[PDB]
Amino acid sequence: RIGGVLLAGAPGTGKTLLAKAIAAEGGVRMFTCSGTDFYDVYSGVGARRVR
Amino acid sequence: TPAIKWDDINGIDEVKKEINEIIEYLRNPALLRSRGVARIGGVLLAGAPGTGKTLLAKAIAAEGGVRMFTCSGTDFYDVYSGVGARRVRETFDRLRNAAPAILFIDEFDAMGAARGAQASGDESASIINELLVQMDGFEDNRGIVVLGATNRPGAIDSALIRPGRFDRIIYMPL
């Protein structure tokens, strides 16, 4: 597998639109999240959320 | 339910009319509606505590010939999560039974505040949600006035200020 892909450019130019178009072409549904969401007030929780 | 007259109070002159509004609301509604006051529930008493307070509210009840209930917001929420919601629920049900009444809550900043230096989790949210729904409506609080004593009205959340909760506010001067 090619694997992880970095999407870069202007702020919010084509990121979610491109991801949704890719998912629609692949016939799958996104599971979108953020790196800010992978955090909590305690330690050892964000890694568990990543897993 | 606890057990110097109103004319024995002389430290206030102008706000005596605003308190007289509460006397006339408890003694004769639909006269208060003819003066534009559709409803009056929560009334906040602010200023320096120790002056008036219980004396004021007792005089209010003694001039309105009406059941008087005393509670402290300190005792409503101590350590128990979710229990305080049922506490204020049962309080308001008892009040709706004995219903002309002047429930007086003391130390309103125990429950009338928002998140801050206390652990604001499920406990304060549940007790303030129950206070909001019991003060708001649906369960008709006919003849029920809640006099809340506070020292920092700006510390009272934007949930109990919204028109229809505790909109009326009385400042006790010196």
């Binding site: - | 120790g50 402290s72 300190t74 005792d75 101590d78 801050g116 206390q118 652990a119």
Partner: protein
């Protein structure tokens, strides 16, 4: 019969008792200091002697309805002798004395704080008339600093709440229990201890 006993051991009777016989040997838990070794604060000594003699059942001022202050706060800079003054009031009052510290009412388990202050006050109420001394009440009576979700902040708030309730209790009729709190950071106290019914006397030392 074991978990309740363990909870009682953890959250009960965490103080010291004075001017009573020892529970194991019968020795009188005395301090040895009276109102003669604390010379230098004579007006406050006269005030504390008046408080003690009024607590002992004086009828000289009950005709006018005078009421003995419920709580008494000793504030001032460190080293002025508030502690030695409290030992002198212990040795002179001859009443069951309950000595504790504000820092002794702190634990990591939720409930302990309130249970300890409740139990202390309850023992005082049963052994009436009694004098309670909590050195450095600012560890308990500290005001809320506008922000924070600390477990210590929870414990401090709960210990406050319980204390405020036990304090307003004594007022009602009740058993004529005098509580004394000595501290140096009195300005770091909350907005409720100063109120009437509560620690209504703040003696500046």
């Amino acid at each position: 019969e074991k978990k309740e006993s363990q909870w009682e051991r953890l959250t009960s009777s965490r103080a010291r008792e004075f001017m009573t016989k020892d529970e194991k040997t019968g020795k009188m838990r005395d301090t040895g200091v009276r109102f003669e070794d604390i010379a230098g604060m004579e007006f406050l000594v006269t005030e504390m002697r008046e408080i003690v003699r009024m607590l002992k059942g004086d009828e000289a001022y009950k005709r006018v309805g005078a009421k003995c202050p419920k709580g008494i706060i000793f504030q001032g800079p460190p080293g002025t002798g508030k502690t030695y003054l409290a030992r002198a009031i212990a040795g002179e009052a001859e009443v069951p004395f309950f000595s504790s510290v504000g820092s002794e009412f702190v634990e990591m388990f939720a409930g302990v704080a309130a249970a300890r202050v409740n139990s202390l006050f309850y023992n005082a109420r049963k052994k009436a008339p009694a004098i309670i001394f909590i050195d450095e009440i600012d560890a308990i009576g500290r005001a809320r600093s506008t922000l924070g979700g600390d477990p210590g902040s929870m414990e401090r708030e709960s210990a406050l709440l319980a204390m405020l309730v036990q304090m307003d209790g004594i007022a009602n009729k009740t058993e004529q229990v005098l509580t004394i709190g000595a501290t140096n950071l009195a300005q770091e106290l909350d907005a409720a201890l100063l109120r009437p019914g509560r620690f209504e006397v703040v003696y500046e030392v």
